Amino acid sequence: EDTVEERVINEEYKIWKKNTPFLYDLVMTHALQWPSLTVQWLPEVTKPEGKDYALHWLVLGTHTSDEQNHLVVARVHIPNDDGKIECEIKINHEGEVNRARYMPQNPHIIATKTPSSDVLVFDYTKHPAKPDPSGECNPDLRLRGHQKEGYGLSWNSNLSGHLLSASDDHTVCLWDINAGPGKIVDAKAIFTGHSAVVEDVAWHLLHESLFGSVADDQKLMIWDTRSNTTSKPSHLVDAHTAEVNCLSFNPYSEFILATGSADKTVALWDLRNLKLKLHTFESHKDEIFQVHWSPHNETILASSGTDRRLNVWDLSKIGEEQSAEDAEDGPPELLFIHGGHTAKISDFSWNPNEPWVICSVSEDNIMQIWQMAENIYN
Numbered sequence: 001e002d003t004v005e006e007r008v009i010n011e012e013y014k015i016w017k018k019n020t021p022f023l024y025d026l027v028m029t030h031a032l033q034w035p036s037l038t039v040q041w042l043p044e045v046t047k048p049e050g051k052d053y054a055l056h057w058l059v060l061g062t063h064t065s066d067e068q069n070h071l072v073v074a075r076v077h078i079p080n081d082d083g084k085i086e087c088e089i090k091i092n093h094e095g096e097v098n099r100a101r102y103m104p105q106n107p108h109i110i111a112t113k114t115p116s117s118d119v120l121v122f123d124y125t126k127h128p129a130k131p132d133p134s135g136e137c138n139p140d141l142r143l144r145g146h147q148k149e150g151y152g153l154s155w156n157s158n159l160s161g162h163l164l165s166a167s168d169d170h171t172v173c174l175w176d177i178n179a180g181p182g183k184i185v186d187a188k189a190i191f192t193g194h195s196a197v198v199e200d201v202a203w204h205l206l207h208e209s210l211f212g213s214v215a216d217d218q219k220l221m222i223w224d225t226r227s228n229t230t231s232k233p234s235h236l237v238d239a240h241t242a243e244v245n246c247l248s249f250n251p252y253s254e255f256i257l258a259t260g261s262a263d264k265t266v267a268l269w270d271l272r273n274l275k276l277k278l279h280t281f282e283s284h285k286d287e288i289f290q291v292h293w294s295p296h297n298e299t300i301l302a303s304s305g306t307d308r309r310l311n312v313w314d315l316s317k318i319g320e321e322q323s324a325e326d327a328e329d330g331p332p333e334l335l336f337i338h339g340g341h342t343a344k345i346s347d348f349s350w351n352p353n354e355p356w357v358i359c360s361v362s363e364d365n366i367m368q369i370w371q372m373a374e375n376i377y378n
């Protein structure tokens with residue numbers, strides 16, 4: 001709604017669009033009726049016989065303050081070397097979907113964060129193919145324990161049905177959704193180490209007992225569910241000089257993780273020694289809200305936020321000599337800047353089946369499916 005900034009954004013986007021055949025091997029844009037605050041690829045892909053596309057799926061949500069919201073699975077066509085978006089299913093949801101994540105052991109089970117305190121669980125096989133327009137939200141489970149909404153949600157990939165949530169109430173709640181409800185589950189544990197909004201939580205990818213939390217108190221905390229305290233973490237890290245909004249564990253190392261912050265930096269961490277930060281990634285011009293490691297490349301990381309950019313980093317290029325030209329555009333470990341969004345990026349997801357494909361969603365209702373040009377990472 002700033003008519004001056006809108007022109008700057010639109011003119012920069014026009015230059016971006018003219019360069020897309022050079023910068024990308026794929027760009028697909030779709031404008032949603034409502035913005036999505038969340039995106040995550042489902043794990044499934046098909047290459048249907050006799051078609052020139054693969055089918056992939058996205059978990060999305062809506063954001064309308066006044067009207068009916070939905071949890072959405074979208075069916076998308078990604079064209080072969082030699083697009084289209086349809087609704088796979090749509091489920092009535094009470095309030096906007098702050099975050100939606102599929103359970104790795106059963107990808108038709110989706111947990112959501114809403115604008116209210118209960119975390120919701122939906123089994124999409126147990127909802128009608130078309131939602132009832134009366135709009136009632138009938139979650140399969142309500143997970144109680146929080147006093148406020150929040151923005152962080154993580155399924156344990158090693159212990160089926162174990163879910164963490166981060167909240168503006170300064171806590172992390174843990175549920176085992178297997179523990180008999182008649183549809184309400186109370187938190188198994190409430191972790192109170194942080195003294196400010198807990199922005200994000202993530203399970204370790206290998207150690208079933210370990211998870212990390214990050215908060216507006218500038219701290220990264222490492223928690224062990226085997227500990228008989230919920231007040232004191234195993235490790236407390238003074239991570240950033242402002243709010244910490246996201247964390248991501250490296251899927252190729254049990255030791256490495258990244259955090260992103262309102263200080264406009266991504267930090268790199270080694271669990272073996274949290275007395276020192278391994279690296280600071282600099283180039284974002286505003287608050288970072290999301291970070292994700294590449295599912296395919298151990299040295300590749302991406303970050304997004306309020307500056308309307310998604311940066312892709314390559315750890316392997318840290319410290320490399322640069323041309324005068326490359327030094328002007330940023331540090332050597334900055335692989336790519338995605339400039340396709342004209343508003344804050346709310347979430348993004350690396351495609352788990354098609355290397356280098358990302359889906360990113362923004363506050364102006366845009367969803368982009370894109371892949372940087374091969375000549376950039378080669």
